[PDB]
Ligand binder design. Sequence first.
Ligand SMILES: CC(C)(COP(=O)(O)OP(=O)(O)OC[C@H]1O[C@@H](n2cnc3c(N)ncnc32)[C@@H](O)[C@@H]1OP(=O)(O)O)[C@@H](O)C(=O)NCCC(=O)NCCSCC(=O)Nc1ccn([C@@H]2O[C@H](CO)[C@H](O)[C@@H]2O)c(=O)n1
Ligand SMILES: CC(C)(COP(=O)(O)OP(=O)(O)OC[C@H]1O[C@@H](n2cnc3c(N)ncnc32)[C@@H](O)[C@@H]1OP(=O)(O)O)[C@@H](O)C(=O)NCCC(=O)NCCSCC(=O)Nc1ccn([C@@H]2O[C@H](CO)[C@H](O)[C@@H]2O)c(=O)n1
Ligand SMILES: Nc1ncnc2c1ncn2[C@@H]1O[C@H](COP(=O)(O)OP(=O)(O)O)[C@@H](O)[C@H]1O
Ligand SMILES: Nc1ncnc2c1ncn2[C@@H]1O[C@H](COP(=O)(O)OP(=O)(O)O)[C@@H](O)[C@H]1O
Ligand SMILES: [Mg+2]
Ligand SMILES: [Mg+2]
Lengths: 814, 814
Amino acid sequence: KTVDSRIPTLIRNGLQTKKRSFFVVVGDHAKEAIVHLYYIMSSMDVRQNKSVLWAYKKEPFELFISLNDIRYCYYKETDKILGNTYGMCILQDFEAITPNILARTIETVEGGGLVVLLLKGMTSLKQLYTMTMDVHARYRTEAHDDVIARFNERFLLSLGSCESCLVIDDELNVLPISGGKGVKPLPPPDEDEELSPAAKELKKIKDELEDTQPIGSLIKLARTVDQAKALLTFVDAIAEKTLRNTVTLTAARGRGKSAAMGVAIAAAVAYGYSNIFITSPSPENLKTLFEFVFKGFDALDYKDHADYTIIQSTNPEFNKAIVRVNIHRNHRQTIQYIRPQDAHVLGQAELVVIDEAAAIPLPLVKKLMGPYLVFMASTISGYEGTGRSLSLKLIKQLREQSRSLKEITLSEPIRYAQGDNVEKWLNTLLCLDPDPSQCELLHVNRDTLFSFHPVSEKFLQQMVALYVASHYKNSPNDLQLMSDAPAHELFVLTGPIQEGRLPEPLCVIQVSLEGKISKQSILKSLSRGQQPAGDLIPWLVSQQFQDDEFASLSGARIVRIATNPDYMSMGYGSKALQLLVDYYEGKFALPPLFSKLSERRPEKLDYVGVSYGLTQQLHKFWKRAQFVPVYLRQTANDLTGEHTCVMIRPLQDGNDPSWLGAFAADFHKRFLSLLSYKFREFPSILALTIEESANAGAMLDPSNAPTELTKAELDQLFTPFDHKRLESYANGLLDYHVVLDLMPTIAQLYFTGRLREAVKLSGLQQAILLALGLQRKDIDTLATELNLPGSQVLAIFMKIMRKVTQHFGALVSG
Amino acid sequence: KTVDSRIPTLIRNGLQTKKRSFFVVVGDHAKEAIVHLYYIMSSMDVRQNKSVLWAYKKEPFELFISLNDIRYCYYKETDKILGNTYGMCILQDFEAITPNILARTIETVEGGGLVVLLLKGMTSLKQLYTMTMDVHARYRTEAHDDVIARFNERFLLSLGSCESCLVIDDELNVLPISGGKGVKPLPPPDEDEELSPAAKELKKIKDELEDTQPIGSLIKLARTVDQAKALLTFVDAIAEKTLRNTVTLTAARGRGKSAAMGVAIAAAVAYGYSNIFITSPSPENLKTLFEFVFKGFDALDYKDHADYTIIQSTNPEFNKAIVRVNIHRNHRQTIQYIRPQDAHVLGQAELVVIDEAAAIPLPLVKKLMGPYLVFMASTISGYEGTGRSLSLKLIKQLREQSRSLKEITLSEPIRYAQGDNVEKWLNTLLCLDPDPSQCELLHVNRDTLFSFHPVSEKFLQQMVALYVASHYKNSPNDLQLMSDAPAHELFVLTGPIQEGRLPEPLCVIQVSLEGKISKQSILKSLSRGQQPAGDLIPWLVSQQFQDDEFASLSGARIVRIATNPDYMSMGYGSKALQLLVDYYEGKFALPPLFSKLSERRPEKLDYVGVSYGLTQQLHKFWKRAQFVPVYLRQTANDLTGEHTCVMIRPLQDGNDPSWLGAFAADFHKRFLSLLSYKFREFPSILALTIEESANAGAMLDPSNAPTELTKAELDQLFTPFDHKRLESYANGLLDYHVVLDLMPTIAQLYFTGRLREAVKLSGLQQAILLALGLQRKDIDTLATELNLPGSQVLAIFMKIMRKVTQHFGALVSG
Ligand SMILES: CC(C)(COP(=O)(O)OP(=O)(O)OC[C@H]1O[C@@H](n2cnc3c(N)ncnc32)[C@@H](O)[C@@H]1OP(=O)(O)O)[C@@H](O)C(=O)NCCC(=O)NCCSCC(=O)Nc1ccn([C@@H]2O[C@H](CO)[C@H](O)[C@@H]2O)c(=O)n1
Ligand SMILES: CC(C)(COP(=O)(O)OP(=O)(O)OC[C@H]1O[C@@H](n2cnc3c(N)ncnc32)[C@@H](O)[C@@H]1OP(=O)(O)O)[C@@H](O)C(=O)NCCC(=O)NCCSCC(=O)Nc1ccn([C@@H]2O[C@H](CO)[C@H](O)[C@@H]2O)c(=O)n1
Ligand SMILES: Nc1ncnc2c1ncn2[C@@H]1O[C@H](COP(=O)(O)OP(=O)(O)O)[C@@H](O)[C@H]1O
Ligand SMILES: Nc1ncnc2c1ncn2[C@@H]1O[C@H](COP(=O)(O)OP(=O)(O)O)[C@@H](O)[C@H]1O
Ligand SMILES: [Mg+2]
Ligand SMILES: [Mg+2]
């Protein structure tokens, strides 16, 4: 009955220092352990006894659940507990706790609380090393069905590296694996006269401005010194009543940026501001901002339903998303929430607050800048953070624009004390925090990369920090995908290195093997709507082209490829791609972490393919490596604003590249017609490059060569009066509005190869002809895009039409 | 040397009563007459000696011009003197004074002034009856070259009907033609104690609110009692601080609506309003509104460059047009000018002022209404007024919408006393102020219609009041065009009437004869860019179709046709049109004003044509009368927002209607391709009706009948994989985004007649197919236009594609 003395000792130390505690329970009676832990935690303190959070998948204790406020949440509903604070968190089903769930469920516990994780009944702790998960179902494919678990090995291996983690059994017995069995009791403090220096500084900052309003009443809301300084900077910018200011605030997750900006909004309202606009990537990012706006209003003695009213958008799915707040104390004032694409409504703005400015595409932010006062906040680390390259681009653009720019930072968290052990363990576990010709490609073994060896861990952090430097929002589920995928392989590009020194990864490539689908399943899928969706390239070309022979081949999909942000644009990605291609072409004739390519026999593959969001810079890189386009989605992505593009390369050695020419020619014929449906927005050059690349890739089939245009076929397209109209226009005797129904036919004649060899056009003429004929654009829209006067775009368009007319006349007369 | 006593008597009476005087000078030394008149006018009064305005075309007096402020203006620059006030106006060149110039140059003279008109040296006053004008050059054509002047006859005949008009010679001698030779001197008044009742009422209204602010200081700006009441209503609406009000103000031209609204804007600014928006058809309508806004600011003790700043749009042509005003007294306030199509920026508005609301198309006004406070002003009579039908529609819609609506009116002018004689004469001269089967068409003689006989004048006013009832802005130049055109004819539709009673005009038709152009001139024009532009239908079809045989025919153009607004939609316009057509088909086997059709032999004409702005209601009326479309402009009209459409009917009796089938078929082939260029905006039904009408009119040529589609031609359009994709979509195994490049081909196949007889489609299916295939519209845009859910529009579109697929399969297999 005597409880081990280390449990209350650790709980008391956490309560004294205001830091969390981690407990892992193994057995079939975890209810008693949780009850005992809660009793021990509650019997020591009274200021920290908040609600208890419980998270699960689908499914004394009886008295315990009937005495405390328990919020029950599903693993899929964890987005609803955002912004709360709990005194205890419980996770029940170990089988389905993805890293995304784990990051969210733990950050909502204040200092001094308990984090309890429940494990199913076991006899030995080694059965988790390969236990099946609820996510492995999506991993399995027809070709590959055996999946080896590696995340759960690292999860138990990392428990011994935490100094605040205790692992106990049903009978409350400490286990050797626990990394906090050496904790000694802390000396009892005396705070009767002793006070922390930070507390004294905070009290002094609050007191020196008590006699001033409204800042004196508002400053009583801050909890950290950095929060107080950020509020001081915001209020100093606001009260200056000059709209030539900009403040950018960057910090980790949980430092207090949203609350600070919310209180600054109330200060701005109290200072006489009328037009206030708030933008964010998602309306779920403003939940605490709009709470602290109302907290500031309450601290300013405003009354509800008499001084302000709240307008809430009930109709869409986000019912709780506030959209508008009206204030009628002295004169009418409003606070409006808009989308980042609605920059045309900011003509009369006075204050625009951009929450999560790093996760917004840069041109949208560039268009949201005006001649007024701007507040920006961004996340640089922690869960859902932004890659360093995007942040560097954002701050570089802001510095280029400058108007006064002031940058501030926050360090100390709010819910728990700085230097918390559980936060450090979580950041570690999820990784949340030479001449090119001389480089060499290597294969990284995944059995030892996830073995928690110090060298392997040091390399894994470097690779993950490499491949997430361009994400808009860091996601820790890709770590589990990389670890537990059955067919994924990792390749790293290193320079010349010596023995005993780990090479620094210049580039990293992740590849997946796809293909080899039985024709019975392809026929079943092509005759119905169901699709396993295990693969991406086999299952898309078959549906788009209604073909049954492509999905039976073998190929590789490049899931991810990323180089060092400091080493970009110097030739390493191309070298790594070429080396991988040569490896798969048979050009090279505790296991060690690094294996040379010459020591392993490659696979026999027919093609290699990639899927990415279309951009000119990325398309040029992929086209230089001999990739040809096959697909281009019509609906743009909401998170970025780009269309998915698929490219395939026929890398097979000594085989006929004819099955790909048909696909390329079909795509080329579809793109010309589809330029009017949702591809009207594309810049002319971007569509021109895709058309040129598809036409060049369609030449892999010699039967796809174009044929000339004869007089007999021409007479079936243009009547003699059409010829007369074209001739009159070419001589300058007609307006260009008259000969405008003939543009699609001439464009289709030129861009399909019939007229290509007869008349030659430059790049600018090709772009103008493509736009006018296939995208149906106006002359004034063309003038803006090309940065040329409108009266000059027509001058070069009359030269396209007086070269075609001569050929038509020679063909008809001859 | 002794001046006639009637001149100073009339001048003194005008000065006493505050009314203008009209003088006409004939001779070669009008300088001395003008000098004497100015001296006589100035020697009596001192409070009215303002600047002298001089208007001319191209080209003691020496001392006279060097002592007074004279503003010299050109006849083409009369738009620059808008809003001013002068004490004397002079018109020099009688040869080019169009009615539009005459209306503008006279309204800017305050009461008590002089209006002097100069006439060239003459021996008899009868030479003006047929004197050539500077406008007659545009009237002459190749076919008709003799023009008879009639406006100058009426101008001299109406001078004798004015009681304030004197006609004098070089030696200052009164002429019998003068209509004010019987004026007797007025008794000398005594205003030492006597005051006008209106002046007493105005003083009382000003005084009873002196102690209140800011209305007490602002009310000192009004000049009439009606202006004061309008300002009181505006300020009462503003100070209520409830945004559920609307005030509509209607009056003649010169009553004080713009100034009243300008002062109300200053009151709103002083009452704490932040967002204020001003819209108008043209930025030249706000010249006095923005002047009185600044006058109110000055009366409110605001200081320039310290309390407000003015932002002016220098870059466009309208440099003087103010676009934005910023106020920073207590908190930032602004006043913005927007275009009527910019209703999307009014999300945060508090006061929207719509000047000249009748001249704006009704849907724009309907979209400018919001949940805020609206001020409207409109012109109902006088120069540049709006027809009564448009105003009735506007007020009926406003009453339907209602929110509180309050309507006010102004009667008494500002610059001159009410009951002015010159204003009455100007309004008179320029006309600024049964079963259908039993009706009969008549021809109106223009030699007696403009002879100033009382009966002829009474009928002319009734006709002009008929044909201007739908104009957005009344223009008095059309009166001169109707009077002096060499080939124009007027027809009126009257019911059964008795002798001695003038019939009431139910409908009026104006026709012009066009055609008969020598082929030499047509060849010269078609081989260059120059065009006489005398005709409209011959000179447009020849250029659009590059044809040389149409312009040599003979035809009639219906310039105007309008019925009684109270008798609309009851069958009179159709009856008049049919009777005119039968008259021109040879179906009928001081001169009197009315001539029966049976008494005159018609002309031999091949076609009849009309040009109008496209609308569904007008297109249906014209199509019912067997008219076929030939042209449709691509650029919309700025004043209305509609595209010009041309329709022609082959009315010739017993001739081949084959020259028109070619034009109709060419237009039908151009419209299908041009639906993507600027006709994407058209509603589906409106384009469908035009396509159906053009296809039906193209059948006048039997060689234009369509042919069936054969398997050989089908195999040259769709590959077997395209057939497989279409079949898969028809069975519900594909997304509609996949088979979307095939839509233009199917639409062109169906709407050109190849597939029309094989597969039958209803009206809704035809509209959806036309939109999706030829206009490239989205599904969500289609759902809004058709007032149907988006998920139901697709359900009926999958029925179009499973009828075409079966025919294609039968054609291929068979
Ligand atoms: C290209 C690169 C790897 C090596 O390039 P290098 O450094 O090695 O440059 P190199 O010397 O070889 O040649 C010089 C030439 O490269 C060009 N170039 C030069 N600098 C840049 C630059 N900074 N950026 C771009 N191109 C550049 C060119 O400008 C220059 O032309 P030029 O000189 O010859 O003038 C390296 O740039 C890089 O990190 N690129 C970005 C990271 C990445 O992974 N790229 C490969 C992507 S595919 C797998 C993949 O992930 N697909 C996706 C993507 C999104 N999504 C969804 O979208 C959402 C998120 O978005 C959502 O989350 C979801 O994810 C998805 O589902 N699947
Ligand atoms: C149609 C009408 C005469 C006789 O029609 P009826 O009274 O007779 O009606 P009816 O019994 O015969 O048959 C019933 C059928 O008529 C229809 N219908 C019934 N009510 C209405 C209605 N209220 N309006 C419309 N259609 C209606 C239908 O709805 C119904 O179909 P439904 O039942 O069988 O259901 C008589 O409506 C009317 O005033 N329409 C307007 C005045 C006018 O002149 N119209 C002829 C125009 S061409 C010459 C001309 O001027 N061209 C231009 C025009 C503009 N511009 C430039 O644009 C600027 C200005 O905009 C710029 O200033 C410049 O001017 C230009 O340069 N040259
Ligand atoms: N001044 C404050 N007073 C009380 N609670 C606060 C204060 N500032 C932050 N918090 C709490 O701490 C959390 C901070 O999260 P937040 O600062 O919104 O994240 P981010 O760093 O992304 O802005 C909030 O959930 C809020 O409940
Ligand atoms: N209260 C006033 N004080 C002085 N002048 C005025 C006043 N109201 C109007 N006016 C003069 O009379 C003219 C009235 O024209 P306006 O009222 O703008 O025409 P509308 O009737 O179309 O609004 C203006 O040119 C202005 O100079
Ligand atoms: Mg935030
Ligand atoms: Mg006006």
